[PDB]
């Protein structure tokens, strides 16, 4: 089991860390959503699908920078939605193929009443998402850590 991004950077077997740079909508209105869709960025696969089943969860999701200060919302994961930042581990997603499959995670953040001006700065860190992978075979318990960065500034009208 190993995951990689759309620009090619990969995390090998056993877990690790990587960086992701996402393009955000330059403006968000009050009462609207800022959508951060990572199902088009992170993909993984099962190396031995004939004999092993891999289970994947979102162990933790934390907010940083402007997302922490100016936003609130939920996270979409495998048929349901949960508060973001997370308060517990999610259900499990099954990986059973050698072909890459999306990691179905998306953020839905709304501006708080104090948000105004440049809410998120370009090149800054907005979230850290931990991917926990177990299996059907042994005691392997690995963490794939993803750091999410903003590729542009986001403004909120006041």
């Amino acid at each position, epitope marked *: 089991f190993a995951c990689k991004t759309a620009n090619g950077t990969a995390i090998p077997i056993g877990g690790g860390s990587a960086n992701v740079y996402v393009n955000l909508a330059p403006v968000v209105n009050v009462g609207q959503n800022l959508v951060v869709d990572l199902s088009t960025q992170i993909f993984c696969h099962n190396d031995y699908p004939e004999t092993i089943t891999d289970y994947v969860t979102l162990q933790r999701g934390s907010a940083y920078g402007g997302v922490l200060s100016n936003f609130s919302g939920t996270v979409k994961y495998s048929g349901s939605s949960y508060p973001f930042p997370t308060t517990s581990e999610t259900p499990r997603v099954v990986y059973n193929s050698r072909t890459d499959k999306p990691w179905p995670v998306a953020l839905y953040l709304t501006p708080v009443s104090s948000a105004g001006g440049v809410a998120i700065k370009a090149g800054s860190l907005i979230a850290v998402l931990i991917l926990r992978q177990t299996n*059907n*075979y*042994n*005691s392997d318990d690995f963490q794939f850590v993803w750091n999410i960065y903003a590729n542009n500034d986001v403004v909120v009208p006041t």
Partner: antibody
Amino acid sequence: QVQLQQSGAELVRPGSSVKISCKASGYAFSSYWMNWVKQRPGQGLEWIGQIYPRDGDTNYNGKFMDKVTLTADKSSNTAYMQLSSLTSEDSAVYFCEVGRGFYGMDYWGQGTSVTVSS
Amino acid sequence: ELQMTQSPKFMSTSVGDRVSVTCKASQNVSNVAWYQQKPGQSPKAMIYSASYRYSGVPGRFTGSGSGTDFTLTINNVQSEDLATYFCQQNSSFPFTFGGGTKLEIKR
């Protein structure tokens, strides 16, 4: 070291049920497959089934599906095999075995003797 | 259920000799293991993946074969090798063992 300890010999009666155990030690009990093997006196070895204790998954032999049930106890690190409607065919020695997931290692219990007599 | 067949059921050699135990399969298998059993004891694993020895196994025991034919070889028996040998496969459910091959001494 890894060790599997089984219960003592059971003398039982036809048509009854019995529950033998295999206590594990020296490894993560819940994270590895546990196999059960039957050896009739004077014959070879037969495979009964396996259990994954963390999630309770089981894979049975078609011959032993209706007779055998398999359970586990995470607290006491003990696996259970249960036989039902004990005919004379069920008198044998039964082993527990953990080998998958360890590189170049294999462990068996000392075996438990089950005697079906009236 | 794949049928694993061994023949002959009995083999007889002497100390220092070479003996080869052959196991026959009914289909294609990728993994074949070999176990050894002395009376009143639980089986002890010898070779896995048809060629590789287990921990604490003397170099006399070697494995070979692929697909459907497999063979366990003992370079020089030492009177500690007098037991029954079974082949096994896990590649399909249910797992099936061989019939067994008892070793003896030629006097």
